[PDB]
Amino acid sequence: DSFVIRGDEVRQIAPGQTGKIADYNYKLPDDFTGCVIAWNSNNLDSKVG
Amino acid sequence: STASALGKLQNVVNQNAQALNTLVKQLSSNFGAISSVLNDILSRLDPPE
């Protein structure tokens, strides 16, 4: 599963988390097995306009 | 007139009653948790702890 989020919201992508992204957009199971990968694309996904 | 001649049966009854009473009493202990009642724990913390 792929998406783009703000820099400060990456903390909410974890089992048993609470916030705004974790409960309204993407909810993870408590016993989730797998892995999470995150990197930065300010030079690609952000524009001067 | 003379009492205390039937100590054995009274002792058996007292032992049974005391064992049941202490088994019931044990419900109020803490056992190292934050409270002795489940509802307060459920209604004051998120599931992870």
Short mmCIF file of all heavy atoms in Angstrom, two decimals, chain A:
data_model
loop_
_atom_site.label_atom_id
_atom_site.label_comp_id
_atom_site.label_asym_id
_atom_site.label_seq_id
_atom_site.Cartn_x
_atom_site.Cartn_y
_atom_site.Cartn_z
N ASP A 1 0.84 -1.19 0.00
CA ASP A 1 0.00 0.00 0.00
C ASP A 1 0.88 1.24 0.00
O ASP A 1 1.76 1.38 0.85
CB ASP A 1 -0.94 0.01 1.21
CG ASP A 1 -1.72 -1.27 1.34
OD1 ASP A 1 -2.17 -1.81 0.31
OD2 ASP A 1 -1.90 -1.75 2.48
N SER A 2 0.63 2.14 -0.94
CA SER A 2 1.46 3.31 -1.16
C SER A 2 0.64 4.58 -1.04
O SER A 2 -0.53 4.61 -1.44
CB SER A 2 2.12 3.26 -2.55
OG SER A 2 1.16 3.40 -3.57
N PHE A 3 1.26 5.62 -0.48
CA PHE A 3 0.64 6.94 -0.42
C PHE A 3 1.71 7.98 -0.10
O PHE A 3 2.90 7.66 0.01
CB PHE A 3 -0.49 6.97 0.61
CG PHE A 3 -0.16 6.30 1.91
CD1 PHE A 3 0.59 6.96 2.87
CD2 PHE A 3 -0.60 5.02 2.17
CE1 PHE A 3 0.90 6.34 4.07
CE2 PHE A 3 -0.29 4.40 3.37
CZ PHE A 3 0.46 5.06 4.32
N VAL A 4 1.27 9.22 0.05
CA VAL A 4 2.13 10.35 0.38
C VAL A 4 1.50 11.11 1.54
O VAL A 4 0.31 11.43 1.49
CB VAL A 4 2.34 11.29 -0.83
CG1 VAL A 4 2.82 12.66 -0.37
CG2 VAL A 4 3.32 10.68 -1.81
N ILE A 5 2.30 11.39 2.57
CA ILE A 5 1.84 12.10 3.75
C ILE A 5 2.87 13.15 4.14
O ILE A 5 3.96 13.21 3.57
CB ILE A 5 1.57 11.15 4.94
CG1 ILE A 5 2.84 10.38 5.31
CG2 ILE A 5 0.42 10.21 4.63
CD1 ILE A 5 2.78 9.72 6.67
N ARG A 6 2.52 13.96 5.12
CA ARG A 6 3.41 15.00 5.60
C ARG A 6 4.57 14.38 6.39
O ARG A 6 4.54 13.22 6.79
CB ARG A 6 2.66 16.01 6.47
CG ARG A 6 3.11 17.44 6.29
CD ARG A 6 2.15 18.41 6.96
NE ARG A 6 1.75 17.95 8.28
CZ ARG A 6 2.51 17.99 9.37
NH1 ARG A 6 3.75 18.46 9.32
NH2 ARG A 6 2.03 17.54 10.52
N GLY A 7 5.61 15.19 6.60
CA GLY A 7 6.79 14.70 7.29
C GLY A 7 6.53 14.31 8.73
O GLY A 7 7.06 13.31 9.22
N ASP A 8 5.71 15.09 9.43
CA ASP A 8 5.47 14.87 10.85
C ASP A 8 4.46 13.75 11.12
O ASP A 8 4.35 13.32 12.28
CB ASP A 8 4.99 16.16 11.52
CG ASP A 8 5.98 17.29 11.38
OD1 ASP A 8 7.17 17.08 11.71
OD2 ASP A 8 5.58 18.39 10.94
N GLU A 9 3.73 13.29 10.11
CA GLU A 9 2.69 12.29 10.32
C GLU A 9 3.20 10.85 10.24
O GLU A 9 2.43 9.93 10.54
CB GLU A 9 1.56 12.48 9.31
CG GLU A 9 0.89 13.84 9.38
CD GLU A 9 0.18 14.21 8.10
OE1 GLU A 9 0.54 13.66 7.04
OE2 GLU A 9 -0.74 15.06 8.14
N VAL A 10 4.46 10.64 9.86
CA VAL A 10 4.99 9.29 9.73
C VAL A 10 4.98 8.55 11.06
O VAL A 10 4.99 7.32 11.08
CB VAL A 10 6.42 9.33 9.14
CG1 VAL A 10 6.38 9.83 7.71
CG2 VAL A 10 7.33 10.18 10.00
N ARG A 11 4.97 9.28 12.18
CA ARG A 11 4.87 8.64 13.48
C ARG A 11 3.54 7.91 13.64
O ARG A 11 3.48 6.88 14.33
CB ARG A 11 5.04 9.69 14.59
CG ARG A 11 5.27 9.11 15.97
CD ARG A 11 3.98 9.09 16.78
NE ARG A 11 3.28 10.37 16.73
CZ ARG A 11 1.97 10.51 16.88
NH1 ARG A 11 1.18 9.47 17.08
NH2 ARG A 11 1.44 11.73 16.82
N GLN A 12 2.48 8.41 13.02
CA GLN A 12 1.16 7.81 13.19
C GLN A 12 0.99 6.50 12.43
O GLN A 12 0.01 5.80 12.66
CB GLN A 12 0.07 8.80 12.75
CG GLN A 12 0.09 10.11 13.51
CD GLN A 12 -1.07 11.01 13.15
OE1 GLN A 12 -2.21 10.56 13.03
NE2 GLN A 12 -0.78 12.30 12.96
N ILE A 13 1.92 6.17 11.53
CA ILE A 13 1.82 4.92 10.75
C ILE A 13 2.53 3.85 11.57
O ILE A 13 3.71 3.54 11.37
CB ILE A 13 2.38 5.07 9.34
CG1 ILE A 13 1.75 6.27 8.64
CG2 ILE A 13 2.15 3.80 8.54
CD1 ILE A 13 0.24 6.21 8.57
N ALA A 14 1.79 3.26 12.51
CA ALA A 14 2.31 2.22 13.38
C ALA A 14 1.15 1.54 14.10
O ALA A 14 0.10 2.16 14.32
CB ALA A 14 3.30 2.79 14.39
N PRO A 15 1.29 0.27 14.48
CA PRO A 15 0.21 -0.40 15.22
C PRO A 15 -0.06 0.28 16.55
O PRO A 15 0.86 0.75 17.23
CB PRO A 15 0.74 -1.83 15.41
CG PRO A 15 1.79 -2.00 14.37
CD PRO A 15 2.40 -0.65 14.17
N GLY A 16 -1.33 0.33 16.93
CA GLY A 16 -1.71 0.94 18.19
C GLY A 16 -1.37 2.41 18.30
O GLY A 16 -0.94 2.86 19.37
N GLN A 17 -1.55 3.16 17.23
CA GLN A 17 -1.28 4.59 17.22
C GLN A 17 -2.58 5.37 17.27
O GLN A 17 -3.66 4.85 16.97
CB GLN A 17 -0.47 4.99 15.98
CG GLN A 17 1.03 4.92 16.18
CD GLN A 17 1.53 5.86 17.26
OE1 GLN A 17 1.04 6.98 17.39
NE2 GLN A 17 2.50 5.40 18.04
N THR A 18 -2.47 6.64 17.65
CA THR A 18 -3.61 7.54 17.73
C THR A 18 -3.22 8.90 17.18
O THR A 18 -2.11 9.38 17.41
CB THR A 18 -4.11 7.67 19.18
OG1 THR A 18 -4.16 6.38 19.79
CG2 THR A 18 -5.51 8.29 19.20
N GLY A 19 -4.15 9.52 16.46
CA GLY A 19 -3.91 10.82 15.88
C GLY A 19 -5.03 11.24 14.94
O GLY A 19 -6.21 11.06 15.26
N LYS A 20 -4.68 11.79 13.79
CA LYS A 20 -5.64 12.14 12.75
C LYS A 20 -5.52 11.27 11.51
O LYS A 20 -6.54 10.85 10.96
CB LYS A 20 -5.50 13.61 12.36
CG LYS A 20 -6.52 14.09 11.34
CD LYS A 20 -7.94 13.74 11.77
CE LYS A 20 -8.38 14.60 12.95
NZ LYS A 20 -9.73 14.21 13.44
N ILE A 21 -4.30 10.99 11.06
CA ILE A 21 -4.11 10.11 9.92
C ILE A 21 -4.44 8.67 10.29
O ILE A 21 -5.06 7.94 9.51
CB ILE A 21 -2.68 10.24 9.38
CG1 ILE A 21 -2.35 11.71 9.07
CG2 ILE A 21 -2.50 9.39 8.13
CD1 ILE A 21 -3.27 12.33 8.05
N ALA A 22 -4.04 8.25 11.49
CA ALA A 22 -4.14 6.84 11.87
C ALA A 22 -5.58 6.38 12.08
O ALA A 22 -5.84 5.18 11.96
CB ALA A 22 -3.33 6.59 13.14
N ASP A 23 -6.50 7.29 12.39
CA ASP A 23 -7.87 6.90 12.70
C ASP A 23 -8.89 7.36 11.68
O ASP A 23 -10.04 6.91 11.73
CB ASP A 23 -8.27 7.43 14.09
CG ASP A 23 -8.13 8.94 14.19
OD1 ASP A 23 -7.50 9.54 13.29
OD2 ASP A 23 -8.64 9.52 15.17
N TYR A 24 -8.51 8.25 10.75
CA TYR A 24 -9.44 8.77 9.76
C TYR A 24 -9.07 8.44 8.33
O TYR A 24 -9.95 8.51 7.46
CB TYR A 24 -9.57 10.30 9.90
CG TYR A 24 -10.59 10.75 10.91
CD1 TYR A 24 -11.03 9.89 11.91
CD2 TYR A 24 -11.11 12.03 10.87
CE1 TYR A 24 -11.96 10.30 12.84
CE2 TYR A 24 -12.05 12.45 11.80
CZ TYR A 24 -12.47 11.58 12.78
OH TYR A 24 -13.40 11.99 13.71
N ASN A 25 -7.82 8.10 8.05
CA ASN A 25 -7.38 7.80 6.69
C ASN A 25 -6.84 6.39 6.54
O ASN A 25 -7.23 5.68 5.60
CB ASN A 25 -6.33 8.82 6.25
CG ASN A 25 -6.70 10.24 6.62
OD1 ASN A 25 -6.48 10.67 7.75
ND2 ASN A 25 -7.27 10.97 5.67
N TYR A 26 -5.95 5.96 7.43
CA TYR A 26 -5.29 4.66 7.31
C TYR A 26 -5.14 4.07 8.70
O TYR A 26 -4.38 4.59 9.52
CB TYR A 26 -3.93 4.81 6.62
CG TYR A 26 -3.42 3.52 6.02
CD1 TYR A 26 -4.13 2.86 5.03
CD2 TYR A 26 -2.22 2.97 6.45
CE1 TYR A 26 -3.66 1.69 4.48
CE2 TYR A 26 -1.74 1.80 5.90
CZ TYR A 26 -2.46 1.16 4.92
OH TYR A 26 -1.99 -0.01 4.37
N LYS A 27 -5.85 2.97 8.96
CA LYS A 27 -5.83 2.31 10.26
C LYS A 27 -5.11 0.98 10.14
O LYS A 27 -5.43 0.17 9.26
CB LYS A 27 -7.25 2.10 10.78
CG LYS A 27 -7.32 1.41 12.13
CD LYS A 27 -6.60 2.23 13.19
CE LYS A 27 -6.85 1.67 14.58
NZ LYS A 27 -8.29 1.75 14.95
N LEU A 28 -4.15 0.75 11.04
CA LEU A 28 -3.41 -0.50 11.02
C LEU A 28 -3.88 -1.43 12.13
O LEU A 28 -4.23 -0.96 13.22
CB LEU A 28 -1.91 -0.23 11.19
CG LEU A 28 -1.13 0.10 9.92
CD1 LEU A 28 0.35 0.24 10.22
CD2 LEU A 28 -1.36 -0.97 8.86
N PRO A 29 -3.90 -2.73 11.88
CA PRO A 29 -4.29 -3.67 12.94
C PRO A 29 -3.27 -3.71 14.06
O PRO A 29 -2.09 -3.42 13.87
CB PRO A 29 -4.37 -5.02 12.21
CG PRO A 29 -3.50 -4.85 11.02
CD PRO A 29 -3.62 -3.41 10.61
N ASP A 30 -3.75 -4.06 15.26
CA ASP A 30 -2.87 -4.11 16.42
C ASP A 30 -1.78 -5.16 16.26
O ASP A 30 -0.63 -4.93 16.64
CB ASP A 30 -3.70 -4.35 17.69
CG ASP A 30 -4.53 -5.63 17.63
OD1 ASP A 30 -4.12 -6.60 16.95
OD2 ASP A 30 -5.60 -5.66 18.26
N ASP A 31 -2.13 -6.32 15.70
CA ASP A 31 -1.19 -7.41 15.50
C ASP A 31 -0.61 -7.42 14.09
O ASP A 31 -0.26 -8.48 13.56
CB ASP A 31 -1.87 -8.75 15.82
CG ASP A 31 -2.82 -9.20 14.72
OD1 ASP A 31 -3.94 -8.65 14.65
OD2 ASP A 31 -2.46 -10.11 13.95
N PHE A 32 -0.47 -6.24 13.48
CA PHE A 32 0.01 -6.14 12.11
C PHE A 32 1.40 -6.73 11.98
O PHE A 32 2.30 -6.44 12.78
CB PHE A 32 0.01 -4.68 11.67
CG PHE A 32 1.06 -4.35 10.64
CD1 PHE A 32 0.89 -4.70 9.32
CD2 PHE A 32 2.22 -3.69 11.01
CE1 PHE A 32 1.85 -4.41 8.37
CE2 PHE A 32 3.19 -3.39 10.07
CZ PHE A 32 3.00 -3.75 8.75
N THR A 33 1.58 -7.57 10.97
CA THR A 33 2.88 -8.12 10.61
C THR A 33 3.27 -7.61 9.23
O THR A 33 2.44 -7.52 8.33
CB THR A 33 2.87 -9.66 10.64
OG1 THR A 33 4.18 -10.15 10.32
CG2 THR A 33 1.86 -10.23 9.65
N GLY A 34 4.54 -7.24 9.09
CA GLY A 34 5.01 -6.65 7.86
C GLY A 34 6.07 -5.59 8.10
O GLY A 34 6.85 -5.70 9.05
N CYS A 35 6.11 -4.57 7.25
CA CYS A 35 7.14 -3.55 7.36
C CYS A 35 6.65 -2.26 6.74
O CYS A 35 5.72 -2.25 5.92
CB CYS A 35 8.45 -4.03 6.71
SG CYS A 35 9.93 -3.12 7.20
N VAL A 36 7.28 -1.15 7.14
CA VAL A 36 6.94 0.18 6.65
C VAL A 36 8.21 0.86 6.15
O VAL A 36 9.27 0.78 6.79
CB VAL A 36 6.24 1.03 7.73
CG1 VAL A 36 7.15 1.29 8.91
CG2 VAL A 36 5.78 2.36 7.14
N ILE A 37 8.11 1.50 4.99
CA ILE A 37 9.22 2.18 4.33
C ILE A 37 8.78 3.61 4.06
O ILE A 37 7.69 3.84 3.53
CB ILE A 37 9.60 1.48 3.01
CG1 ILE A 37 9.76 -0.02 3.22
CG2 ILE A 37 10.87 2.09 2.44
CD1 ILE A 37 10.78 -0.39 4.25
N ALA A 38 9.63 4.57 4.44
CA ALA A 38 9.30 5.97 4.26
C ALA A 38 10.53 6.74 3.81
O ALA A 38 11.63 6.52 4.33
CB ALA A 38 8.74 6.59 5.55
N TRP A 39 10.35 7.64 2.85
CA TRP A 39 11.43 8.52 2.42
C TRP A 39 10.84 9.86 2.00
O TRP A 39 9.63 10.08 2.08
CB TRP A 39 12.27 7.88 1.31
CG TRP A 39 11.63 7.87 -0.04
CD1 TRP A 39 11.86 8.74 -1.06
CD2 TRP A 39 10.68 6.92 -0.53
NE1 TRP A 39 11.09 8.41 -2.15
CE2 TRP A 39 10.36 7.29 -1.85
CE3 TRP A 39 10.06 5.79 0.02
CZ2 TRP A 39 9.46 6.57 -2.63
CZ3 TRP A 39 9.16 5.09 -0.75
CH2 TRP A 39 8.87 5.48 -2.06
N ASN A 40 11.71 10.77 1.56
CA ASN A 40 11.33 12.16 1.32
C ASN A 40 11.40 12.47 -0.17
O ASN A 40 12.32 12.04 -0.87
CB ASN A 40 12.25 13.11 2.09
CG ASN A 40 12.41 12.71 3.53
OD1 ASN A 40 11.53 12.08 4.12
ND2 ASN A 40 13.55 13.07 4.13
N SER A 41 10.41 13.23 -0.64
CA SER A 41 10.34 13.64 -2.04
C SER A 41 9.95 15.11 -2.14
O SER A 41 9.09 15.49 -2.95
CB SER A 41 9.37 12.77 -2.83
OG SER A 41 9.59 11.39 -2.55
N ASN A 42 10.57 15.96 -1.32
CA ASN A 42 10.31 17.39 -1.39
C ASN A 42 10.71 17.95 -2.75
O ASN A 42 10.00 18.79 -3.32
CB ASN A 42 11.05 18.12 -0.27
CG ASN A 42 10.66 19.57 -0.16
OD1 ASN A 42 9.48 19.92 -0.23
ND2 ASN A 42 11.65 20.44 0.02
N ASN A 43 11.85 17.51 -3.28
CA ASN A 43 12.31 17.95 -4.59
C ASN A 43 11.48 17.39 -5.74
O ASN A 43 11.66 17.84 -6.88
CB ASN A 43 13.78 17.58 -4.77
CG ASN A 43 14.04 16.10 -4.59
OD1 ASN A 43 13.11 15.31 -4.39
ND2 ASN A 43 15.30 15.70 -4.66
N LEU A 44 10.58 16.44 -5.49
CA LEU A 44 9.74 15.87 -6.53
C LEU A 44 8.26 16.16 -6.31
O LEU A 44 7.57 16.56 -7.26
CB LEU A 44 9.95 14.35 -6.63
CG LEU A 44 11.01 13.84 -7.61
CD1 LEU A 44 10.62 14.20 -9.04
CD2 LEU A 44 12.40 14.37 -7.29
N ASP A 45 7.74 15.96 -5.10
CA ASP A 45 6.32 16.08 -4.84
C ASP A 45 5.91 17.47 -4.36
O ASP A 45 4.74 17.68 -4.04
CB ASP A 45 5.88 15.02 -3.82
CG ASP A 45 5.43 13.73 -4.48
OD1 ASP A 45 4.66 13.80 -5.46
OD2 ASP A 45 5.85 12.65 -4.02
N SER A 46 6.84 18.41 -4.31
CA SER A 46 6.55 19.79 -3.93
C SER A 46 6.95 20.73 -5.05
O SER A 46 8.01 20.55 -5.67
CB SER A 46 7.27 20.18 -2.63
OG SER A 46 6.82 21.44 -2.16
N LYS A 47 6.11 21.72 -5.31
CA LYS A 47 6.33 22.68 -6.39
C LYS A 47 6.35 24.10 -5.83
O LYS A 47 5.70 24.39 -4.82
CB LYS A 47 5.25 22.56 -7.46
CG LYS A 47 5.43 21.38 -8.40
CD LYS A 47 4.50 21.48 -9.60
CE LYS A 47 3.08 21.80 -9.18
NZ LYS A 47 2.14 21.80 -10.33
N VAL A 48 7.10 24.97 -6.50
CA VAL A 48 7.20 26.36 -6.07
C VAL A 48 5.83 27.04 -6.09
O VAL A 48 5.55 27.93 -5.27
CB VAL A 48 8.23 27.12 -6.93
CG1 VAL A 48 7.79 27.15 -8.39
CG2 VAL A 48 8.44 28.53 -6.41
N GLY A 49 4.96 26.63 -7.01
CA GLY A 49 3.60 27.12 -7.02
C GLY A 49 2.67 26.43 -6.04
O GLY A 49 1.50 26.81 -5.93
#
